[model samples]
Target: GSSGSSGHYIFPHARIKITRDSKDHTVSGNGLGIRIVGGKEIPGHSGEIGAYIAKILPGGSAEQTGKLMEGMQVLEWNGIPLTSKTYEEVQSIISQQSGEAEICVRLDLNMSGPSSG
Candidate 1:
């Protein structure tokens, strides 16, 4: 019997599945980006935003307008606070663009240690 297949699902669809890799950004990796200082999995839910990095990529629109990644967590369009809920939702925010919206990818160099070794 088939448990799951392509496009939609036979029984149901799982919301989240996490894989620990050396990198981020996949063809279809559903993730919300927010750096954490200390997070512990509490059986079910991951805790609230630990360390927030509201940022702009180097050549991104935010950078072109002189915005920096210095803010903790601000509701911003190009430096202004978010006007609507759906307005600044990252995925939806990038959907309307013709090309890619150069999103920021932050890695915690200090956190990377020899775990498998």
Candidate 2:
């Protein structure tokens, strides 16, 4: 038997503009201090997938802003749409940038709920 409870739900979205200085450099080369996991690695509702914030490194560019959170979905990166891009493409774009970058993220409703992790 399959699992019960089938429903469709949409999540609220929020866009954040993060500015990273060139001085902040991480081993990954993006200096954002945040690790991103592509949609291909994640399973979503109706197969809808995108880049997700996997981890936020401490003392990194993104951590300084305090705007980004883990489990959030990345819709746009540095004004570039991520919908048509692959995981490697997204990582490439972020690594190529040397100065500042702005990202738009979609907040997951499930993440906001009170639950035991």
lDDT of each: 0.29, 0.62
Model 2 lDDT vs. the true structure? Answer: 0.62
- Return the TM-score for candidate 2, rounded to 2 decimals: 0.66
**Per model, how many backbone clashes are there?**
1, 0
Give candidate 1's whole-model lDDT. 0.29
Each prediction's TM-score versus the true structure = 0.23, 0.66
lDDT of 2 by residue, 1-117 (tens): 332694212556666666666554445555457666554433455666567676777667677778788767777677676665687877776666666677777766222222233
Looking at candidate 2, the ten consecutive residues that score lowest on lDDT are 108-117
The alpha-carbon deviation from the true structure for residue 86 of candidate 2, after best TM-score superposition, in angstroms, is 1.9
Estimate the TM-score for candidate 1. 0.23
